[PDB]
Design a protein around this ligand. Structure first.
Ligand SMILES: *[C@@H]1O[C@H](CO)[C@@H](O)[C@H](O)[C@H]1NC(C)=O
Ligand SMILES: *[C@@H]1O[C@H](CO)[C@@H](O)[C@H](O)[C@H]1NC(C)=O
Lengths: 240, 183, 181, 12, 171
């Protein structure tokens, strides 16, 4: 159907960001929306055929190109912190027919690239009071001190991703809400039965996917390069 | 033209009905799609109605269209937790090669807690902060935000195995979890 | 969202019973209510009533306004009736239980809608009408109410108290039991 | 003690 | 036979005293809030389709707007700076703490305001939510699983604004 590229992107103010969209639905119309946490689907650019580009609702700062029917590009000539949003490409057979959205691309444009930091992931094993009272065991994960907001957390039990009993905060929170461009923190919960946590053969791993510096970009600062990486923390079941 | 999607946020207890009402300006509008967006995903079409119909009930959804009042609505009878998502309005007219969206309504279906048992627990350090846990609280209970700096409290969260949870952690040494959740 | 929250002018009214109430609250606790029959203000804490004067007529004026709005909104919505809800009761004492000492038993009832209920105290399946005082219909964020009833009792030798609740949303009354010592 | 007043709803 | 309910809610939100005040009025029909005023917005905005007639009708009356906007001062500020500062804010009720057994339980009751800090230096303890007795008093139950003859427990420490020094009742 509709395929966007890339899926996640981090850039600095003044760079060039080219969002690619390939549709294979034989649709003449393609659209570029952005979706900010201040909710709503705001239309940027769109096109009714190959070689056509139309200004949507918020065209300023963006440029679109429709070289073929299959591809519809969104070009950020001079990147700005305002461009930080979630961008959706959508195709459609007719303006009065269903839209088919791509899976969205999360973009983070930053004023200073030296403020990027990976998350520090920690797993906290369940409390003894919860196990004896509720006969259930809640593990807790913490991804702390990371920047920007690009973060994806998942739970892995015995090498396979679990979803049942998982609860992640919908949005990461600022460590200092008063400070501008503060670091973020994310908490997630995995609740299992007390028997399951008491089995020493059960392997719990909280995996946090971070998006940062690209391969073409360079760091050259004091610490290590905060490139896009996975930071994980593990815990084993304990009979005691 | 433009659409208004008035119930910005809709909080409903599960099993009860819920409805979103929208209006449109252009009386030549002939296509009214409804899109549902689950957290972390894209919007997907779930139902639409065209100007040659008043009512349409398919796939457990109902959409109505009052062309005279230039208002149209979606109805979700007997909600379930799987209904909580962002729902979007839209209208289309033959003289515009685009549709006009509403600002969305975040539908929130609160799960039924059959036997609640609220309590606060404190997890193991596991080698740098102290983390505490407030779980099994009823849906109505709202976790108040931490006015104390250097104390972090996350909002409510519901997990199906259905139990609410809230995590509060802090780096400060003088930190106790008997009343860390000041609710 | 803030350090303190005050509810001033909370007004309720029902059309079939011709019943409403007017209350003021601060930080989740009831400041007073207006007795519509006696046309007087009944402060929850009498000490605060000597410091603050609220003439009851203001409350009755907000009641009359919602009484009129109810007739308007009942037509505006296509006569949508109230959805009877299931109240979740809970019993607990005010202070730690000491065998033979005086203590107050509380029957916390939550998620009440409509605000019509019968909270009764039974002593070993025996009707008790003495020593019981209930608060007004306090309000919640989901626009449901919660009402608390108080029973002064002397705990001893398994008295087997329980709190009975009668609501339209309950086909059978819910009884919560409590005992100590 | 101050109070907030109740508006009358639109009637038709 | 059938039942209909209407609720109106005037709400005043104070943070840092009267520094920032927020007025929110809510008109509610059968659990559905249809129109609300919010001092952040400055006018009446419909919440559901039910509220559109009222929000449009009340905004056309500059007096309803003027009076409603003024209620952030004539109701919110006035009630806090006067009645509440003289009653609810000044109220301090010292807690009553006592340790019993059944798993040792430390009961802290009859206190005001809400801020409290009950602790034992031992972890593994389950504490309940802050219980709101509707008599303007609170209570907190802190409960720790106890084993036999594990020495003499140090304290059940209790920290409260009403208390200049903690109670620290020994087991
Ligand atoms: C009002 O409700 C009745 C009974 O459900 C129904 O017959 C009628 O069509 C409704 N009117 C409107 C305008 O929805
Ligand atoms: C509540 O009790 C009264 C008697 O005081 C009775 O008339 C009424 O029907 C009762 N209502 C319910 C819902 O039980």
């Amino acid at each position: 159907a509709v395929t966007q590229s890339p899926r996640n992107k981090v850039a600095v103010t003044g760079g060039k960001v080219t969002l690619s969209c390939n549709q294979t639905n034989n649709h003449n119309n393609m659209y570029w929306y952005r979706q900010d946490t201040g909710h709503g689907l705001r239309l940027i650019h769109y096109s009714y055929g190959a070689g056509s580009t139309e200004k949507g609702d918020i065209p300023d700062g963006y440029k679109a190109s429709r070289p073929s029917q299959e591809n519809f590009s969104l070009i950020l000539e001079l990147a700005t912190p305002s461009q930080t949003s979630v961008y959706f490409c959508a195709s459609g057979g007719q303006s009065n027919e269903r839209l088919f959205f791509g899976h969205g691309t999360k973009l983070s444009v930053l004023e200073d690239l030296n403020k990027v930091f990976p998350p520090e992931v920690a797993v906290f094993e369940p409390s003894e009071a919860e196990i004896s009272h509720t006969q259930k065991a809640t593990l807790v994960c913490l991804a702390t001190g990371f920047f920007p907001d690009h973060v994806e957390l998942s739970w892995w039990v015995n090498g396979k991703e679990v979803h049942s009993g998982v609860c992640t905060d919908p949005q990461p929170l600022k460590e200092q809400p008063a400070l501008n461009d503060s670091r973020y923190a994310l908490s997630s919960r995995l609740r299992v039965s007390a028997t399951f946590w008491q089995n020493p053969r059960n392997h719990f791993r909280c995996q946090v996917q971070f998006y940062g510096l690209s391969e073409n970009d360079e760091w050259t600062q004091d610490r290590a390069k905060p490139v896009t990486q996975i930071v994980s923390a593990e815990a084993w079941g304990r009979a005691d | 033209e433009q659409v208004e999607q008035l119930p910005s946020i809709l909080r409903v207890q599960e099993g009860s009905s819920a409805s979103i009402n929208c209006t449109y300006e252009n009386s030549a509008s002939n296509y009214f799609p409804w899109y549902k967006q689950e957290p972390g995903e894209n919007p997907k079409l779930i139902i639409d109605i065209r100007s040659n119909m008043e009512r349409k009930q398919t796939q457990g959804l109902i959409v109505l269209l009052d062309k005279k009042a230039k208002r149209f609505s979606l109805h979700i009878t007997d909600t379930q937790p799987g209904d909580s998502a962002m729902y979007f309005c839209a209208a289309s007219d033959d003289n515009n090669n685009r549709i006009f969206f509403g600002d969305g309504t975040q539908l929130v279906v609160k799960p039924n807690i059959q036997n609640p048992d609220p309590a606060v627990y404190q997890l193991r350090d596991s080698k740098d902060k102290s983390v505490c846990l407030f779980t099994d609280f009823d849906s109505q209970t709202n976790v108040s935000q931490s006015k104390d700096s250097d104390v972090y409290i996350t909002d409510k969260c519901v997990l199906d195995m259905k139990s609410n949870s809230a995590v509060a952690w802090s780096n400060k040494s003088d930190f106790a979890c008997a009343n860390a959740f000041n609710n | 969202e803030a350090d303190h929250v005050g509810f001033y002018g909370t007004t309720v009214y029902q059309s079939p019973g011709d019943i409403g109430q007017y209350t003021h609250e601060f930080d989740g606790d009831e400041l007073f209510y207006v007795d519509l029959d006696k046309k007087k203000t009944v402060w929850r804490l009498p000490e605060f009533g000597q410091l603050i004067l609220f003439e009851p007529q203001g409350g009755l004026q907000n009641i009359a306004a919602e009484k009129h709005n109810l007739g308007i909104l009942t037509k505006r919505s296509n006569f949508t009736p109230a959805t009877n809800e299931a109240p979740q009761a809970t019993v607990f004492p005010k202070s730690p239980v000491l065998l033979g000492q005086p203590n107050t038993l509380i029957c916390f009832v939550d998620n009440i809608f409509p605000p019509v209920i019968n909270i009764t105290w039974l002593r070993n399946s025996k009707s008790v009408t003495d020593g019981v005082y209930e608060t007004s219909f306090l309000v919640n964020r989901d626009h449901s109410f919660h009402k608390l009833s108080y029973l002064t009792f002397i705990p001893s030798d398994d008295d087997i108290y329980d709190c009975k609740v009668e609501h339209w949303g309950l086909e059978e009354p819910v009884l919560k039991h409590w005992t100590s010592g | 003690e101050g109070r907030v007043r109740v508006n009358s709803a639109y009637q038709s | 036979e059938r039942h209909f309910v209407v609720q109106f809610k005037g709400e005043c939100y104070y943070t840092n005293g009267t520094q920032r005040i927020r007025l929110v009025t809510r008109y509610i029909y059968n659990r559905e809030e249809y129109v609300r005023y919010d001092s952040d917005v400055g006018e009446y905005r419909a919440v559901t389709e039910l509220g559109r007639p009222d929000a449009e009708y009340w905004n056309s009356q500059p007096e309803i707007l003027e009076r409603t906007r003024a209620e952030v001062d004539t109701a919110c500020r006035h009630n806090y700076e006067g009645p509440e500062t003289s009653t609810s804010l000044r109220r301090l009720e010292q807690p009553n703490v006592a340790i019993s057994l059944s798993t040792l339980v430390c009961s802290v009751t009859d206190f005001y305001p809400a801020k409290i800090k009950v602790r034992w230096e031992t972890v593994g303890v389950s504490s309940t939510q802050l219980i709101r007795n509707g008599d303007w008093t609170f209570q907190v139950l802190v409960m720790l699983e106890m084993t036999p003859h594990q020495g003499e427990v140090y304290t059940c420490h209790v920290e409260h604004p009403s208390l200049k020094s903690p109670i620290t009742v020994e087991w």
